RNA sequence: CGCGGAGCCUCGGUUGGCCUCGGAUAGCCGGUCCCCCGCGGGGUCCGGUGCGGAGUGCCCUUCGUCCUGGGAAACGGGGCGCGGCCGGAGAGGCGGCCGCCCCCUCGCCCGUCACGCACGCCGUUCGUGGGGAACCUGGCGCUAAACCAUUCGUAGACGACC
RNA sequence: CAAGCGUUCAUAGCGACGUCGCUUUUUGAUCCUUCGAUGUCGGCUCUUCCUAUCAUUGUGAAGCAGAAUUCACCAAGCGUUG
RNA sequence: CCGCGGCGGUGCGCCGCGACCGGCUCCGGGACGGCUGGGAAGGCCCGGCGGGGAAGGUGGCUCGGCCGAGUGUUACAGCCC
């Protein structure tokens, strides 16, 4: 796996029917990836760990986007996680405060990169779930979280440092 | 009585790093720092202009001391508003970091 | 000391990006670089928008912190931004840049002339003020 | 993790009048006037209390290590206020077995002159900083009094003579001689 | 742009500037960097001193008068850094360096010219405010300048002078503005045509 | 020094911009009624600007020629026009400011006519009295030193040096 | 890491059974270069560099009272002889 | 010879133009299909049913000229969700 900006390529797939068992079960995984072709591939990595199921012996029935029910409304995304460190393999609760499940983990994958040097091909999402106000543990998130919430954008650099690559005026950064 | 010939520098000829390819020159036009910017400069005539020592003929004139390799802008060259231009004869390297004179007169407005 | 307190409801002019040069009410703050942003009457959907691409104004308005379009439709509409903006010094030096780029070679020939004689009628008075400033010194 | 806000109010008394030039705080009370620049630390110093009741230091888009400093500025300001109201007094009591450490101040404060520490012929001299008035005490035997408005200045100067007076090539477990600070206090107590 | 450039070194970043200088030197543009004492460097004071002293030990053992020349003045130091970003073995590289010109303090002609500033090499922009630094002035001193004191006292003398001009120039603008108001009905249908296509609003 | 006539060559260019200090979780400017200092400087108060409009996103000045016969504008400009007093030294090289002669009347609107209209074509326009190397006019000044040879040694291989 | 010694006490000073490294001033392996042969051991003289600090400067240790002594840091500034 | 009429070759030397075509590299438009017969949103309202932050609120405290501003709590809706 790599990345781009992730999307919920949700998927169900049966283990194709033998003469002995004619109506084997079906199973939606929230496979959670950059396009179809991998999000197909990613249930079967994932199902092949859980069930005794395989790309020969199966079929994807339905693969398709699940696409956000509330994408104009900010939300407190938690994520029972699992990864593989250079040492062992480790579980995590983590919170991202984006407004869209996918974009919320899009974060996570970019932080596991940064806060741990964990690459996507090592990570496993157990399950994302949006959380209410309370029942958030991470003070990073637990502050954006109020009503009379208040900023200045203190030491705002200029970008456009090459439009006028030179100038007479020195810049400004108080605004 | 002024520019017309609009101001530009000749930067290098199109090159890799352990190669260089002397057909196509790289032209640094003044006041154009984006690849969006540069679609005007496409197609335009340009001229590396000199004097050199012996006299030479001049259309609408008497024999002058001035000569020119006489060319044309093909296309843009990377994000920053550089341009690639191939003149009729190849440019003489002496000109590196000198003027060339990109005109307007094959305008397309 | 600052004076522009990224609230729920700082009007922000979008410096740049897909919606450049439009005003936008910051509905609510998502994160440490991203807001939930909406410009009802300036034609900008409720969407996420970063603090780096937006600069912010002395103006506030008073929807509350996840109000739903209809309610930021109002509070903008009365309070009246799109008239109060346009009496600002922003709006008049924007809509000046605008008018220089938007200027035919004719217009520019006129100005060349109009300036020149302005700059003489201004100069002769400055010369005359130094005469009076020198006679005052005497 | 960056913390959206941290702040602290210093409660300024009725005696004193602080007036901050941007970031640079100046403080004038009864005793004198002090100044100090926080042109490093980078915070927002407001003087919110009208009449004149509060210095408030903000900090604002700050991670852990600058959040520290909110409180440190807040301190060097209290520490100024105490200095320009009350004024500080570090006492330092000379200590020995044998050779009497023999102190003698020599312009006003300024030169603190020390014969005989441990029988040494070299007469240690020590300058004070500006605004630090040293003086030999009374009502006690071997005891200096360093008076000044500025903590910073008064306690280098303690330490300068406390450190000028150090033994070498011995057991400083045993050789417990020299001059050292016994009591950090104030001139006026209230 | 055209013509001679003058860059005011203060508040810039030693190499970040020099890369920008050196690009334009190679495009035939004449640059004149001024006031190189003021030029400043990322990393803390000592770090870069220690890094300079490392330079000074680098030295051609079998004869040193051949070996590297560790010039001490900031002008010279910067030159070096620009030069390392030119192909200075070759003719265009030496022809380039000649288009450069670099001073400590700010001299005749160049006192008397307005002068520019590369924001993309400018320290306030490029650096974070919670980071440490050297001024190439103080660095240059502790490495073997003789002339931090002099270029101080001269620049103080120049600053005092320049301030006079700034104030007299300030006084002409006050006359311009008062004379606009003292003649605003025989330029009141020219100023119109200015503000209509943007100019002067 | 001025101002004159030809000609090898070596090139780059093709309006200028004549100025604070610096801050950056801050600045810019005004005005002071008031206060202190040396027309200025410092202070305090208020009033404006501050994604900056006495903004390098900037300002200025013009760019086919002259006619003449209205208005707007009217003492502006010139004669390498001419003397005196400044100020400027970091490696000045430039300003600045005062008499007198002669000459001219120009920026913006307009009438009104004109300029080889070369019959769709290229190095067009200037910084150009460039830089440098050779030669034709007047006035005023000028008016050698160096090296060899010799001598000396304070120095020595010879060279070098006193 | 740490079982011990050190009157007592792990670790002032030491430190077993184990275990992780450097280093190329020891010898081995190896046989990459040279057999149209690069002078093959020591001594003298003379430079310069390193630190893997024996002295000295400034320091922190000690089971340092002094005296004397070892442990360690910056440190290679000048020393190392007949 | 004057035609430079019609045909066949070229250009002395420097050049410019045009319209087909091949290959490219770009740039403007405009119309549709599908999809959890797309999610989301808007407007208009209406009639309902619930929950949280939190009030045109109340209240403890502060700061300013009953009003304006700050914090603290129960939570109905006279805001919003
Ligand atoms: Mg020419
Ligand atoms: Mg001892
Ligand atoms: Mg024991
Ligand atoms: Mg041999
Ligand atoms: Mg060592």
Coordinates of C-alpha atoms in Angstrom, one line a residue, chain A residues 9-165:
Chain A
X9 CA -13.5 1.4 -0.9
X10 CA -16.0 -0.8 1.2
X11 CA -16.2 -4.4 0.1
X12 CA -18.0 -7.7 0.5
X13 CA -16.9 -11.1 -0.7
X14 CA -17.9 -14.8 -0.4
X15 CA -15.7 -17.9 -0.6
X16 CA -17.1 -19.2 -3.9
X17 CA -19.5 -22.1 -3.5
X18 CA -18.4 -25.8 -3.5
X19 CA -20.8 -28.7 -4.1
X20 CA -20.8 -29.3 -0.3
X21 CA -21.6 -25.7 0.7
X22 CA -23.8 -23.8 -1.8
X23 CA -24.6 -20.5 0.0
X24 CA -21.4 -19.5 1.9
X25 CA -21.5 -16.3 4.0
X26 CA -20.8 -12.7 2.7
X27 CA -18.7 -10.1 4.6
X28 CA -18.5 -6.2 4.3
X29 CA -15.0 -5.0 5.4
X30 CA -14.4 -1.3 5.6
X31 CA -11.4 -1.5 3.4
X32 CA -10.0 1.8 3.3
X33 CA -7.7 2.8 0.5
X34 CA -6.8 5.1 -2.6
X35 CA -8.8 3.4 -5.4
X36 CA -10.7 0.1 -6.1
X37 CA -7.9 -2.1 -7.4
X38 CA -6.0 -2.0 -4.1
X39 CA -9.1 -1.9 -1.9
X40 CA -10.1 -5.0 -3.6
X41 CA -6.6 -6.4 -2.9
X42 CA -6.8 -5.1 0.7
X43 CA -9.8 -7.1 1.9
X44 CA -8.1 -10.2 0.7
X45 CA -4.9 -9.5 2.6
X46 CA -7.2 -8.9 5.5
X47 CA -9.8 -11.7 5.1
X48 CA -7.0 -14.2 4.4
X49 CA -5.7 -13.5 7.9
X50 CA -9.1 -14.0 9.5
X51 CA -10.9 -16.6 7.4
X52 CA -9.4 -19.5 5.5
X53 CA -10.2 -17.6 2.3
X54 CA -8.2 -16.8 -0.9
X55 CA -8.1 -15.0 -4.3
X56 CA -8.5 -18.3 -6.1
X57 CA -11.2 -19.7 -3.8
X58 CA -13.3 -16.4 -3.6
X59 CA -15.1 -13.6 -5.3
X60 CA -15.6 -10.0 -4.6
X61 CA -19.3 -9.5 -4.8
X62 CA -19.6 -5.8 -4.3
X63 CA -16.9 -3.2 -4.0
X64 CA -17.8 0.4 -3.9
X65 CA -17.3 3.8 -2.2
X66 CA -19.0 4.5 1.0
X67 CA -18.9 8.3 0.9
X68 CA -19.6 10.6 3.7
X69 CA -22.9 11.0 5.2
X70 CA -21.9 14.2 7.1
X71 CA -19.1 16.0 5.3
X72 CA -20.0 19.6 6.3
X73 CA -19.9 18.9 10.0
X74 CA -16.8 18.6 12.1
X75 CA -16.3 15.2 13.9
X76 CA -14.1 13.4 16.5
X77 CA -12.6 10.4 14.7
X78 CA -11.1 7.6 16.9
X79 CA -9.4 4.6 15.5
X80 CA -8.6 1.2 17.3
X81 CA -5.3 0.8 15.3
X82 CA -2.5 -1.7 14.9
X83 CA 0.9 -1.4 13.5
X84 CA 4.3 -3.0 13.1
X85 CA 7.3 -1.2 14.7
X86 CA 10.9 -2.1 14.0
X87 CA 10.7 -4.0 17.2
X88 CA 7.3 -5.6 17.7
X89 CA 3.7 -4.8 16.7
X90 CA 1.6 -2.3 18.6
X91 CA -2.1 -1.3 19.2
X92 CA -3.2 2.4 19.4
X93 CA -6.2 4.6 20.2
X94 CA -5.7 7.9 18.2
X95 CA -7.9 11.0 17.5
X96 CA -8.1 13.2 14.4
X97 CA -10.6 16.0 14.3
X98 CA -11.2 16.2 10.5
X99 CA -14.9 16.3 9.1
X100 CA -14.9 13.0 7.0
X101 CA -13.9 9.4 8.1
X102 CA -11.5 9.0 5.2
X103 CA -9.7 12.3 5.5
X104 CA -9.5 11.5 9.2
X105 CA -7.3 8.5 8.6
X106 CA -5.6 10.1 5.7
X107 CA -4.3 12.1 8.7
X108 CA -3.5 9.0 10.8
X109 CA -1.5 7.4 8.0
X110 CA 0.5 10.7 7.6
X111 CA 1.2 10.8 11.4
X112 CA 2.2 7.2 11.8
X113 CA 4.7 8.1 9.1
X114 CA 5.9 11.1 11.1
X115 CA 5.4 10.2 14.8
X116 CA 6.7 6.7 14.3
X117 CA 8.3 6.1 10.9
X118 CA 5.6 3.5 10.2
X119 CA 4.8 3.0 6.5
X120 CA 1.3 2.1 5.3
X121 CA 2.3 -1.5 4.3
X122 CA 2.9 -2.0 8.1
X123 CA -0.3 -0.4 9.5
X124 CA -3.7 -2.0 10.0
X125 CA -6.8 -0.1 10.9
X126 CA -9.0 -2.2 13.3
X127 CA -11.8 0.3 13.1
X128 CA -12.6 3.9 12.8
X129 CA -15.6 5.3 14.7
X130 CA -16.7 8.9 15.2
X131 CA -16.9 9.9 18.8
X132 CA -19.1 12.4 20.7
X133 CA -17.8 15.4 22.6
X134 CA -17.0 13.7 25.8
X135 CA -15.1 10.3 25.6
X136 CA -12.2 12.0 23.9
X137 CA -8.9 11.5 25.6
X138 CA -6.4 13.4 23.5
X139 CA -5.8 16.9 24.6
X140 CA -4.6 17.8 21.1
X141 CA -8.2 17.3 19.9
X142 CA -9.9 18.1 23.2
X143 CA -9.3 21.8 22.9
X144 CA -10.7 22.7 19.4
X145 CA -13.6 21.6 21.2
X146 CA -15.3 24.7 22.8
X147 CA -17.7 27.5 21.7
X148 CA -15.9 30.9 22.2
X149 CA -12.7 29.4 20.5
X150 CA -10.1 32.0 19.8
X151 CA -6.9 32.6 17.6
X152 CA -4.6 35.0 16.0
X153 CA -2.3 33.8 13.4
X154 CA 0.6 35.2 15.3
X155 CA 3.9 35.2 13.3
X156 CA 2.4 34.8 9.9
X157 CA 5.3 34.5 7.4
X158 CA 5.0 35.8 3.9
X159 CA 5.0 33.2 1.3
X160 CA 5.2 34.8 -2.2
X161 CA 8.8 35.4 -1.2
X162 CA 9.7 35.2 -4.9
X163 CA 7.0 37.5 -6.2
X164 CA 9.2 40.4 -5.7
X165 CA 12.3 38.1 -5.5

